């Protein structure tokens, strides 16, 4: 199936500012979305906001705003700070659009015509913060915003509350058997493998039916009205997956405007996502209802969801009230954004909880993107080493040199594979590896000595450092997105070889081609004190 990949990140709640989990997971979104376009592939990557729902709702009455006044100023925080971000998210969906709106009442008459929706009770607790029902033994005891004595969820430690409400019911418990048989038969569907074995023994167990609605009231009627019941509003979180879909079907100006909605989604051939990017707290959202849902719709599944970690910083919990910021924009103009990309997706994989600091943070910069790669890439572009500023023809080949072609050979595929697993950590170590490897060869053949004492053997050892710049460079650029076009403007890399799975190959740049022009004090990663 030749398709769109598709590719997205969670939608985010608008109680409170964009902060670094947001950037974070739709960071690792668009690396994704990039790695695909390089390979030549169509891509459509979707971010946007959750604007629904009783959590934003109430805050939106604690800065004492209207809910639409409220919702329009975050979101276009959100959009700003992505803008900022430099990423290249294809749309940002928002759960207020009318065309979203459609789509979930489409959506939810599907799933009432089915006779997998009756009208029932809840009586149970819930976590207005997560938006999530919980049983009793998923719930603490803890202390609210007074310090009195309350209930808490184990899960996040926010307050919970016990409602009791008549409310449309969706039959979760009859979707336990076909979602074993789901994940059992695609058994890549859930990354990381160990999250994948979290949501199969939670299954297992058995399944409750789940409250899709809630009375009106209760959500401050900032929701979307059932279907033909007025009276009720449908649960966040079936609108807020819906997106994925309402994503799959709005065709999208230049501009980044939703234009128009279609009705069905083979149209533009985006659904089901190959991907849905998540943060490990709305795992079973996405890998137990989403997937119920979809089933009692009759829709695809989707063939991939990635769950990550969350940050820390200096080893201690990110919050304003505490004492501990993390501001990714001023980090970033600090540092360097395509810099602080890197940090955070080579830092940890997605089964940790990574974290920043400012000594580490450094210690990459300095030792991997100015010592290993800066370095190399100013060497083989040097007057001094590459005296013609050209790429030259390269003489026989030695056995060392071999063992270095191999490995620029071999770097494709495996960087492919952990791209599409995805694990973007063990493709950067993995282009890293083979920069290292470059860097000891040159150590080895010391070519600054070679320009004097063998030009010819200077040629061969040149090129092939040419090369390896070239492909670990073409790897990483959905990861350095501003420095790989730098680098191949250093080493004059025409357009047309800047991506497509043809210029994975070895030696798809030929002798000849000439070097960029040099700049008077130009570096490419400036190293930072300690
Ligand atoms: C369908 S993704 C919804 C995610 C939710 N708004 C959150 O911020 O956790």
Redesign the pocket.
């Given at each position: 199936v030749e398709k769109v990949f598709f590719v997205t990140?969670?939608?985010?709640?608008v109680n409170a500012a964009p902060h670094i989990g947001?950037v974070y997971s739709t960071l690792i979104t668009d690396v994704i979305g990039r790695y695909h376009r390089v390979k030549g592939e169509r891509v459509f990557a979707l971010t946007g906001?959750?604007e629904h729902?009783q959590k934003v709702a109430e805050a939106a009455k604690q800065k004492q705003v209207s809910p639409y006044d409220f919702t329009t100023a975050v979101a276009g925080e959100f959009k700003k700070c992505f803008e900022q971000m430099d990423y290249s998210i294809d749309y940002f969906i928002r759960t207020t659009n009318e065309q979203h709106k459609a789509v979930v009442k489409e959506l939810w008459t599907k799933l009432e015509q089915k006779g997998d929706i009756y009208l029932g009770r809840y009586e149970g607790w819930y976590s207005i913060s997560?938006?999530s029902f919980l049983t009793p033994q998923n719930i603490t005891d803890g202390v609210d915003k007074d310090g009195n004595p309350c209930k808490v969820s184990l899960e996040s430690g926010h307050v919970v509350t016990w409602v009791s409400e008549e409310n449309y019911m969706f039959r979760l418990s009859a979707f336990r058997e076909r979602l074993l048989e789901w994940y059992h038969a695609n058994p890549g569907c859930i990354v990381p493998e160990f999250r994948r074995r979290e949501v199969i023994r939670a299954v297992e167990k058995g399944l409750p039916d789940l409250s899709v609605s809630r009375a009106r009231a209760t959500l401050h009627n900032w929701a979307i009205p059932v279907p033909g019941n007025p009276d009720h509003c449908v649960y966040?979180?079936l609108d807020?997956?819906?997106?994925?879909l309402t994503g799959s079907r709005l065709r999208v100006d230049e501009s980044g405007k939703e234009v128009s909605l279609v009705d069905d989604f083979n149209e533009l051939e985006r659904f089901p996502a190959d991907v849905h990017v998540?943060?490990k707290?709305?795992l079973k959202?996405?890998a137990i209802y989403?997937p119920a849902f979809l089933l009692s719709a009759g829709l695809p599944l989707p063939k991939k969801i990635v769950a990550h970690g969350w940050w820390t910083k200096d080893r201690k919990k990110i919050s304003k009230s505490l004492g501990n910021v993390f501001d990714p924009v001023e980090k970033a103009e600090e540092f360097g954004y395509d810099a602080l990309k890197y940090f955070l997706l080579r830092e940890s994989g997605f089964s940790d909880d990574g974290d920043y600091s400012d000594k580490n943070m450094i210690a990459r910069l300095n030792g991997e993107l100015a010592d290993t790669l800066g370095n190399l890439v100013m060497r083989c572009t040097s007057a001094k080493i590459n005296v013609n500023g050209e790429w030259p023809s390269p003489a026989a080949y030695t056995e060392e040199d071999e063992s270095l072609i191999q490995l620029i050979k071999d770097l494709p595929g495996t960087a492919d594979h952990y791209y599409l697993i995805p694990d973007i950590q063990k493709a950067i170590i993995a282009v890293f590896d083979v920069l290292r490897a470059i860097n000891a060869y040159v150590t080895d053949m010391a070519p600054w000595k070679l320009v004097k004492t063998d030009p010819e053997r200077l040629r061969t050892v040149l090129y092939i450092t040419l090369e390896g710049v070239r492909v670990t460079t073409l790897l990483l650029s959905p990861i350095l997105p501003r420095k790989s076009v730098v680098i191949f403007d250093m080493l004059g890399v025409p357009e047309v070889h800047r991506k497509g799975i043809e210029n994975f190959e070895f030696g798809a740049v030929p002798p000849g081609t000439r070097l960029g022009p040099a700049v008077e004090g130009e570096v490419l990663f400036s190293k930072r004190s300690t």
């Open positions: 990140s969670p939608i985010y709640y947001h906001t959750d729902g997560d938006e966040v979180w807020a997956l819906t997106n994925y998540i943060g707290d709305i959202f996405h989403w």
